[PDB]
Design a protein around this ligand. Structure first.
Ligand SMILES: Nc1ncnc2c1ncn2[C@H]1CC[C@@H](COP(=O)(O)OP(=O)(O)OP(=O)(O)O)O1
Ligand SMILES: [Mg+2]
Ligand SMILES: [Mg+2]
Ligand SMILES: [Mg+2]
Ligand code: NA
Length: 538
DNA sequence: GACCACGGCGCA
DNA sequence: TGCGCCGTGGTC
């Protein structure tokens, strides 16, 4: 059992933080284990210097805290990553111990011993799983070191800008609230959907379309209000009000208060075992849902800036998941569109409408996007009729016309579900698996929900695999050029480069990303450079 | 002060 | 399709 600090080489680490965010955490305890023998650090911060590598459960979090302290402690093996590859429903140390053995406690020594035991257990289970092993060695394990650097680096925020924006938005919010109260004939809490439901459907007697899932209230969702956009002018004002309060409560107000005292920057967490499909997620705060789609929303992006003397480089894969779908399905028409360098959404609109290529306006292109994404998500003709604001039968017609233009997409969905029923799981191009139960359920709604999850995963997950692999390849090149990787948003990366290097970094990053893994179609990357995230989008 | 479920909505 | 965070309403 016990033995004196320091631990031997290759030992597994255990640690306890005062809070979940490693950039903010006090390191309460540090221990290590090897051969079941546990070493406990008398003083954790000092002991941190004695480690060569962070090897154990949640290795990346310890590495981030180390980098914060000025120490170069790279994360190595982590049983969480092995478990996540075996089955992406394995998302937490608590859950992994419960499933495979042992107990996740709040004591660093026990956590270190548990890390060692779970590693041996899960490594053995991956014996012979060559494609999952490749993902571990070539994507996930090296990716964790990249993520550690991204987290510790953080991103600079224009706090003064957001403070000013806050005053501006507040004035607009107050104006709209007054108008809404005027139309309703009395004040209420406009932020309470319960109070709004009564006002709209009981007091003003507007027709109530949909109901909410768990409790069966009359919905006030944007989708419901959209269809009432003329049944009363109060609805227009409510939707405007909601857009602004969303921006204010979620981004404008909270973000400026999260600037770190040492770095003077904002630090997110990139969670590596958090999704069913192999995507990353981001939290504390989430920087993967910064507004960008509307003019009002875009203003938030201006707040994300480069260090003095640096620039942001923003790179995004064009129509990434549709290119992946083209590769997986082998559809000749999809592949041809991308091969010919044509715009997939415009080619789709030309076919979905009266054509030709040149006659496709901005409205039609936006409609084609909606149809295309619908296909990816298996969205219903009802949902599509809502989004497009067209009759139900017209949305039905569009979905059928889609599969006429891209027939092998339908065949691919069927092949994917056929094999999924047989094997109990589906997989990405590189062999990342998701176990999807209920593919043969006897209740149609349950079965069909499982089907949509199952055929989407190889697309979403292959795209995630390719992005992760691109990050692993790109990081070392950026290091050699004195540049930094800051953010990933699924199909997009944001880098930071000294001004004099930015052009060279952008050129190299584009080539690394486009060439990450050749497919039946080219991967195209759009790149922009600017002093802020909005202006960088070029 | 802290926890939660729900409806709702931001991004991919 | 996949996420994480918001305020409200409720609770301990
Ligand atoms: N309104 C929406 N609904 C569902 N998914 C959406 C979406 N908007 C985006 N996504 C998802 C799906 C795609 C991904 C990125 O959105 P891009 O805007 O970049 O769509 P892209 O295919 O590249 O078309 P392009 O940019 O040339 O107009 O996020
Ligand atoms: Mg795009
Ligand atoms: Mg984007
Ligand atoms: Mg929820
Ligand atoms: Na239901």
């Amino acid at each position: 059992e016990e033995a004196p600090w320091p631990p031997p080489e290759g030992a597994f680490v255990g640690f306890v933080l005062s809070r979940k965010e490693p950039m903010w955490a006090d390191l309460l305890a540090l221990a290590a284990a090897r051969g079941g023998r546990v070493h406990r650090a008398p003083e954790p911060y000092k002991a941190l210097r004695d480690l060569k590598e962070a090897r154990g459960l949640l290795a990346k979090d310890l590495s981030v805290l180390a980098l914060r302290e000025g120490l170069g402690l790279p994360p190595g093996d982590d049983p969480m990553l092995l478990a996540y590859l075996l089955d992406p429903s394995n998302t937490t140390p608590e859950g992994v111990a419960r499933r495979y053995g042992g107990e996740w406690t709040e004591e660093a020594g026990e956590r270190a011993a548990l890390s060692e035991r779970l590693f041996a257990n899960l490594w053995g289970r991956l014996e012979g799983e060559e494609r999952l092993l490749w993902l571990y060695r070539e994507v996930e394990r090296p990716l964790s070191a990249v993520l550690a650097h991204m987290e510790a680096t953080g991103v600079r925020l224009d706090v003064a800008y957001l403070r000013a924006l806050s005053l501006e938005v507040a004035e607009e919010i107050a104006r709209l609230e007054a108008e809404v109260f005027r139309l309703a004939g009395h004040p209420f809490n406009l932020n309470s959907r319960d109070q709004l439901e009564r006002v709209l459907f009981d007091e003003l007697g507007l027709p109530a379309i949909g109901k909410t899932e768990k409790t069966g209230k009359r919905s006030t969702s944007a989708a419901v209000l959209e269809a009432l956009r003329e049944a009363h002018p109060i609805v227009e004002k409510i939707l405007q009000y909601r857009e602004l309060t969303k921006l204010k409560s979620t981004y404008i107000d909270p973000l400026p208060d999260l600037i770190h005292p040492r770095t003077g920057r904002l630090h997110t967490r990139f969670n590596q075992t958090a999704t069913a499909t192999g995507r990353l997620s981001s939290s504390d705060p989430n920087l993967q849902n910064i507004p960008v789609r509307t003019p009002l929303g875009q203003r938030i992006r201006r707040a994300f800036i480069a260090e003095e003397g640096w620039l942001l480089v923003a790179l995004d894969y064009s129509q990434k998941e549709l290119r992946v779908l083209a590769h997986l399905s082998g559809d000749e028409n999809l592949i041809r569109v991308f091969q010919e360098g044509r715009d997939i959404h415009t080619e789709t609109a030309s076919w979905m409408f009266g054509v030709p290529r040149e006659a496709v306006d901005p409205l039609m292109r936006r409609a084609a996007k909606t149809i295309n994404f619908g296909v990816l998500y298996g969205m219903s003709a009802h949902r599509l009729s809502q989004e497009l604001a067209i009759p139900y039968e017209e949305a039905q017609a569009f979905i059928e016309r889609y599969f006429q233009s891209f027939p092998k997409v339908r065949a691919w969905i069927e092949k994917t579900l056929e094999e999924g029923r047989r094997r109990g799981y589906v997989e990405t191009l590189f062999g990342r698996r998701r176990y999807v139960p209920d593919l043969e359920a006897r209740v149609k709604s349950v079965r069909e929900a499982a089907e949509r999850k199952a055929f989407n995963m190889p697309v979403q997950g292959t795209a995630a695999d390719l992005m992760k692999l691109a990050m692993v390849k790109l990081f070392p090149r950026l290091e050699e050029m004195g540049a930094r990787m800051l953010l990933q948003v699924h199909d997009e990366l944001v880098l930071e480069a000294p001004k004099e290097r930015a052009e060279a970094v952008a050129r190299l990053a584009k080539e690394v990303m486009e060439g990450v893994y050749p497919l039946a179609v080219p991967l195209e990357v759009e790149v922009g450079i600017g002093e802020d995230w909005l202006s960088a989008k070029e």
